[PDB]
Amino acid sequence: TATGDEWWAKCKQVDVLDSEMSYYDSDPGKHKNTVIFLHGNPTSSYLWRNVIPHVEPLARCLAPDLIGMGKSGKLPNHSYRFVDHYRYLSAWFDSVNLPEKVTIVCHDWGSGLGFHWCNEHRDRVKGIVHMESVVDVIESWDEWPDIEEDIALIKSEAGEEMVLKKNFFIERLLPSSIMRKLSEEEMDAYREPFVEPGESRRPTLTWPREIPIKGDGPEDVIEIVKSYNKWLSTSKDIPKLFINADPGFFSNAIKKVTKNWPNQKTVTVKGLHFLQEDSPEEIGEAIADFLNELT
Numbered sequence: 001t002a003t004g005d006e007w008w009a010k011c012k013q014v015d016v017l018d019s020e021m022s023y024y025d026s027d028p029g030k031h032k033n034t035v036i037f038l039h040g041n042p043t044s045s046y047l048w049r050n051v052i053p054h055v056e057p058l059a060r061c062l063a064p065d066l067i068g069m070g071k072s073g074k075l076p077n078h079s080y081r082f083v084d085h086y087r088y089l090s091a092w093f094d095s096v097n098l099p100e101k102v103t104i105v106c107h108d109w110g111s112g113l114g115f116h117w118c119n120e121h122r123d124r125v126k127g128i129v130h131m132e133s134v135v136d137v138i139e140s141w142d143e144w145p146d147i148e149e150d151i152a153l154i155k156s157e158a159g160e161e162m163v164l165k166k167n168f169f170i171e172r173l174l175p176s177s178i179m180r181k182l183s184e185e186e187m188d189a190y191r192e193p194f195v196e197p198g199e200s201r202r203p204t205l206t207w208p209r210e211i212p213i214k215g216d217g218p219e220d221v222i223e224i225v226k227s228y229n230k231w232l233s234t235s236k237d238i239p240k241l242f243i244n245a246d247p248g249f250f251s252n253a254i255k256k257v258t259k260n261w262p263n264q265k266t267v268t269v270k271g272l273h274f275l276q277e278d279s280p281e282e283i284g285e286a287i288a289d290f291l292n293e294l295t
């Protein structure tokens with residue numbers, strides 16, 4: 001239904017350091033909860049468009065486009081590592097009138113950014129809802145989807161060609177992990193940030209190169225994931241909602257990683273990796289119920 005123009009015309013923009021980030025912000029009013037939605041690779045705030053209306057009745061809902069993605073600014077040095085994204089997203093957090101306690105709803109690399117933000121601002125966290133999330137370092141490939149060889153390929157010089165020239169993540173990976181078929185308006189919304197070939201597509205390539213593989217990953221990312229995984233593994237006072245996807249992609253592995261995490265509820269919905277496009281109403285209602293139980 002809702003087109004890219006329709007969605008981004010509901011969004012605001014805010015200067016962030018040298019650049020600017022676009023974001024959805026629900027209409028100002030009286031509200032008891034503030035919920036931030038973080039997408040990952042290769043999507044944008046558009047990914048939450050059908051989830052958010054089920055949470056807005058009870059929360060101010062923010063959804064930023066990460067730097068270089070959606071309608072946020074492109075960085076001239078083309079450097080979009082995890083640590084760069086966190087720099088701009090942290091500044092964004094500081095610029096949108098957040099109350100003292102927020103709930104984070106995150107997905108894919110958005111969960112990596114959000115988990116790290118929560119671990120660094122533990123006093124600001126009311127709750128965490130996560131799905132298909134970066135919950136741990138990948139220490140043995142046998143407990144995870146078998147993408148070892150794909151990651152090796154994407155780290156190779158063939159990565160530049162697959163992504164920058166052929167837009168592999170948008171054109172092949174994205175539709176392959178959505179059970180239904182996206183309308184052309186929906187698929188154009190995901191295309192829009194990356195229509196120009198070359199370095200405009202750089203974030204969708206840098207993101208998989210950051211994947212924290214023990215002994216094979218960037219060590220700044222590994223150290224961050226290890227530290228937020230330790231903290232999460234005993235976060236007794238942080239109510240957590242793991243939305244498990246069936247069949248999912250990482251969902252099976254995440255179930256095993258977090259089986260002994262305290263204060264995590266699990267709700268299951270139908271979907272592959274981009275579960276928001278297959279079960280948005282179930283995902284939004286679960287978040288609504290989760291916030292309702294918080295009070």
Ligand SMILES: O=c1n(Cc2ccc(O)cc2)[nH]c2c(Cc3ccccc3)nc(-c3ccc(O)cc3)c[n+]12
Pocket residue numbers: 041108109132133134135136147150151154173174176177207208209210211249250254273
């Ligand atoms: O880093 C990657 N994350 C971040 C992440 C890590 C651990 C975790 O628990 C959660 C999230 N995710 C991916 C995905 C996921 C996906 C995207 C779209 C469709 C299907 C699957 N797929 C790849 C990849 C797949 C083929 C390739 O040829 C190259 C890369 C890489 N990552």
